[PDB]
Design a protein around this ligand. Structure first.
Ligand SMILES: Cc1c(Oc2ccccc2OCCn2ccc(=O)[nH]c2=O)cc(CC2CC2)c2ccc(C#N)cc12
Lengths: 547, 401
């Protein structure tokens, strides 16, 4: 007998202050009992489990569905925390084409790695006897039990330690571990590749690990995690979008998840009108109708999902390019590629929840997102193609009160172009009229007044119902913008209005702010000045609006 | 050569902080560095029974192309028990010059308490989550940990004892992996003395605090004022009245009586000139009742002034500034605001280390996503301060300009 190499165990402990599980065994039918006796008999023959005496006080329930199933939920509650390196799956767009590719599953994954002997006594379970006239048969696990908290991490670390020397002495191949499968690829000739696969399964056999002996049961195309991997390209598995005249919240969540899934290769997917209906969630049963924007949106989603689109694999010798387009209503779409009309992948970005916003900020956020995704998938930042002129970005970042930055990028002239819609002056304007604005509201009656007095004697006070102080200050500024020429100086005391305008929005949720923006767009020059309130500053008339 | 037992604060488990993605060159650099350290016993590989993790990344310090390994021990530092204290040298900030030295390598000779090693675990990530990350834990005192200087204090004192007995006029302070050396010599004699100290540390950043002080509030001096000039002046004086008790603006607001054009020249009355003069005399004095409290946090606020100019204020109580300043240094960051902000954060943090011996909490004028995306690309210090993000444009911008 060729001596097998030992696999060193991983020391496992329970959570601090906790003890092993003590759960009562369930009553089973005589058929189920006989089945579990046969299964556990063959398992003990194979060495996976061992009979234990009555000294062990821990017990874990067992069921038969014949297949044996042990419910380790309590032991999982009582087992320590492990380090799982499976936090995010690899994206196919990050893979590099290989001439030959092979999938080797490891049969009896968790049942080939030994368990820490000091911990085995916590995995004890009992088989009930016929009519419960004899003591049930007691067993404990000698290997990693499937369903136990620590089996994936320990199995993965053991497999890594086994695979390290073979990968070291084979730099010309690539090996990936995932769950109960290994994926090996190489650009060698098919004969040499198959040879090195034989060497690999031999090296795994030296430790007592088995691979598919026949022709490897999985050949291209490979279906994996909603993906289709092909020899030359990749895509997503075909979509399944249900159609029903009565939609629920859970169905909206599944549809949103599926459309977001399809958006990673199909360019132009939009999910805003369907995601707006998820306001007031946690009630999975409901009937939510759809608007014309949502119906046309889903129809366009079926239109894009009509014909299949594929993505290519990554080539490190070529540059990495990401191009962004504005879609409207805070929606942005991007493509990552290396050669024209051959996308590595695609995606979308939706603006955050905010009261005010502009296109330049949203484009910046989309750039940051794409940068992080690119560093994840390819380990580098791509070069960007952005629909914004170099001068526009220059003016923006040079005048922005916050610090901002975009990595290396170039301008692509694909409308609609992101642009600055207005720019306030830095100094007062000579020859322009000076509008001193003010507004105020009564907290109880919600009655207010908004208006202005100017240096030319122009005046206005307008009374308002169902308003607030902030609303009357914005309204005052808006009145000055409506009744002034193409150049105007405006004096206010509203720290609120100045806070809104100094953030430079081009779109808002407040109709008053949007009307102010529309007025600013039509102006040649606007100088907005601020003064303290109630300081006896002549011109600024708090008493004119407090009547 | 003898390990000192180290524990955690009661009721606190080890750190479990996610490792953020790294570029391929940073991953390769960390692979090489960590391999070399493993061959030297400073770190050892760990198994899946260690659930703890601390972020790691790679930088390049000044005047060096060699990649350096930086561990974000912030969570572990605040989860590590308080080690006790040496009073901060109040004369280090008063000295003419201070040089900062990187004494981090000296930590790697002292072994780390075994039972604590599982808390310093870190992960070298992989691109695209292809292979599992390379997990390590420290065997010796790690750089960036707060217990490393606390444990090495006795050894460090024994090393510098001859030098301290030689030059009593040289102040020596220690913070994390850095040694601050203050003196009053000449730049040449300073550099030669620094070489003497570094070879003294071998066989076992010019910074002049005198050229930085505190900055007063100044008002314009004009022969003719416009309505806009007086409006801005009244705004600034009203703001400064939150800091100084006796500021009054009624005689200057009296000039604005009426709805005049903003560019119209207004002559100052005698009462207005008197009020402005009294406000000047008030502003020339220091602030009333401003004290430092070692039990409170230090807050730093940074305003972007444009054209590579930046203002900052370190305080504890609002309007009770302990330090103010204006970083306007230009060093290859002309086209990058984030690089400028990051260098400014580093300089302000260094000043804060010199004055009070601890770092302030920053309020950064930047969106969280931009900063979190780019700040490690320009970081060169071994420590890391705490920061938050101001999203509303403050009005007191030009009032600090
Ligand atoms: C064979 C295989 C994977 O194969 C590879 C293994 C090693 C290196 C590159 C590989 O693929 C590069 C891209 N590619 C992909 C498929 C193909 O035919 N040809 C090709 O050049 C890589 C992953 C990526 C993930 C593991 C990291 C897989 C995932 C799932 C399945 C299945 N079933 C098989 C996988």
């Amino acid at each position: 007998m060729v001596p097998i190499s030992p696999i060193e165990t991983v020391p496992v402990k329970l959570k601090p202050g906790m003890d092993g599980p003590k759960v009562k065994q369930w009553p089973l039918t005589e058929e189920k009992i006989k089945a579990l006796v046969e299964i556990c008999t063959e398992m003990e023959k194979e060495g996976k489990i061992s009979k234990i005496g009555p000294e062990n006080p821990y017990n874990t329930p067992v069921f038969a569905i014949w297949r044996k199933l042990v419910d380790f939920r309590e032991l999982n509650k009582r087992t320590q925390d492990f380090w799982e390196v499976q936090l995010g799956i690899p994206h196919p767009a990050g893979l590099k084409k290989k001439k030959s590719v092979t999938v080797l599953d490891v049969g009896d994954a968790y049942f080939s790695v030994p368990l820490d002997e000091d911990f085995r006594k916590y995995t004890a379970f009992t088989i009930p006897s016929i009519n419960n006239e004899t003591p049930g048969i007691r067993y404990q696990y000698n290997v990693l039990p499937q369903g136990w908290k620590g089996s994936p991490a320990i199995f993965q670390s053991s497999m890594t330690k086994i695979l390290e020397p073979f990968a070291a002495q084979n730099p010309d191949i690539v090996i990936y571990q995932y769950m109960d499968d290994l994926y090996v690829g190489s650009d060698l000739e098919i004969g040499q590749h198959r040879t090195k696969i034989e060497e690999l399964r031999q090296h795994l056999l030296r430790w007592g690990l088995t691979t598919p002996d026949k022709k490897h049961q999985k050949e291209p195309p490979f279906l994996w995690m909603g993906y289709e991997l092909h020899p030359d390209k990749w895509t997503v598995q075909p979509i399944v979008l249900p159609e029903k005249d009565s939609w629920t919240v859970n169905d909206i969540q599944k549809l949103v998840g599926k459309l977001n899934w399809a958006s990673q290769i199909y360019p132009g997917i939009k999910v805003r009108q369907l995601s707006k209906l998820l306001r007031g969630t946690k009630a999975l049963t409901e009937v939510i109708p759809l608007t014309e924007e949502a119906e046309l949106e889903l129809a366009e989603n079926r239109e894009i999902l009509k014909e299949p689109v594929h993505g290519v694999y990554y080539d490190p010798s070529k540059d990495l390019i990401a191009e962004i387009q504005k879609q409207g209503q805070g929606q942005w779409t991007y493509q990552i590629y290396q050669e024209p009309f051959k996308n590595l992948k695609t995606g979308k970005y939706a603006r955050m929840r905010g009261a005010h916003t502009n296109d330049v900020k949203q484009l910046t956020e989309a750039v940051q997102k794409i940068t992080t995704e690119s560093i994840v998938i390819w380990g580098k930042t791509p070069k960007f193609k952005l629909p914004i002129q170099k001068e526009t970005w220059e003016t923006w970042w040079t005048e922005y009160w916050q610090a901002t930055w975009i990595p290396e990028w170039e301008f692509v002239n694909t409308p609609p172009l992101v642009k600055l819609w207005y720019q306030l002056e830095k100094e007062p304007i000579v020859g322009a009229e000076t509008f001193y604005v003010d507004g105020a509201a009564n907290r109880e009656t919600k009655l207010g007044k908004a208006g202005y007095v100017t240096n030319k004697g122009r005046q206005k006070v307008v009374p308002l119902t169902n308003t607030t102080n902030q609303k009357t200050e914005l309204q005052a500024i808006y009145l000055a913008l409506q009744d002034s020429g193409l150049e105007v100086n405006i004096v206010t005391d509203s720290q609120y209005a100045l806070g809104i305008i100094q953030a430079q929005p081009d779109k808002s949720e407040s109709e008053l702010v949007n009307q102010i923006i529309e007025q600013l767009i039509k102006k040649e020059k606007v100088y907005l000045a601020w003064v303290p309130a109630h300081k006896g500053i002549g011109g600024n008339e708090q008493v004119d609006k407090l009547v | 050569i003898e390990t000192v037992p180290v524990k955690l604060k009661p009721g606190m488990d080890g750190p479990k902080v996610k490792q953020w993605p790294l570029t391929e060159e940073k991953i390769k650099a960390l692979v090489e560095i960590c391999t070399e350290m493993e061959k030297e016993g400073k770190i050892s590989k760990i198994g899946p029974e260690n659930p703890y993790n601390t972020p790691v990344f790679a930088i390049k310090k000044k005047d060096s192309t060699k990649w350096r390994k930086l561990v974000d021990f912030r969570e572990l530092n605040k989860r590590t028990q308080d080690f006790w204290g040496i009073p901060h040298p109040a004369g280090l900030k008063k000295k003419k010059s201070v040089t900062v030295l990187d004494v981090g390598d000296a930590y790697f000779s002292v072994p780390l308490d075994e039972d604590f090693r599982k808390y310093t675990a870190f992960t070298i990530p992989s691109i695209n989550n292809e292979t599992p990350g390379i997990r390590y834990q420290y065997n010796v005192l790690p750089q960036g940990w707060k217990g490393s200087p606390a444990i090495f204090q006795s050894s460090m004192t024994k090393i510098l004892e001859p030098f301290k007995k030689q030059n009593p006029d040289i102040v020596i302070y220690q913070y994390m992996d850095d040694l601050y050396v203050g003196s009053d010599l000449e730049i040449g004699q300073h550099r030669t003395k620094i070489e003497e100290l570094r070879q003294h540390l071998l066989r076992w950043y010019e910074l002049h605090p005198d050229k930085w002080t505190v900055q007063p509030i100044v008002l314009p001096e004009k022969d003719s004022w416009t309505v806009n000039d007086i409006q801005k002046l009244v705004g600034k004086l009203n703001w400064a009245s939150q800091i100084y008790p006796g500021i009054k603006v009624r005689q200057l607001s009296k000039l604005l009586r009426g709805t005049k054009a903003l560019t119209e020249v207004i002559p100052l009355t005698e009462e207005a000139e008197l009020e402005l003069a009294e406000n000047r005399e008030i502003l020339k004095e220091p602030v009333h009742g401003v004290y430092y409290d070692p039990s409170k946090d230090l807050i730093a606020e940074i305003q972007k002034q444009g054209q590579g100019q930046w203002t900052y204020q370190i305080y504890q109580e609002p309007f009770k500034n302990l330090k103010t300043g204006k970083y306007a240094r230009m060093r290859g960051a002309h086209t990058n605001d984030v690089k400028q902000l990051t260098e400014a954060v580093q300089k302000i943090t260094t000043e804060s280390i010199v004055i009070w011996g601890k770092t302030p909490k920053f309020k950064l004028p930047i969106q969280k996503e931009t900063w979190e995306t780019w700040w490690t690309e320009y970081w060169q210090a071994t420590w890391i301060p705490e920061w938050e993000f101001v999203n509303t444009p403050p009005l007191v911008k030009l009032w600090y300009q």
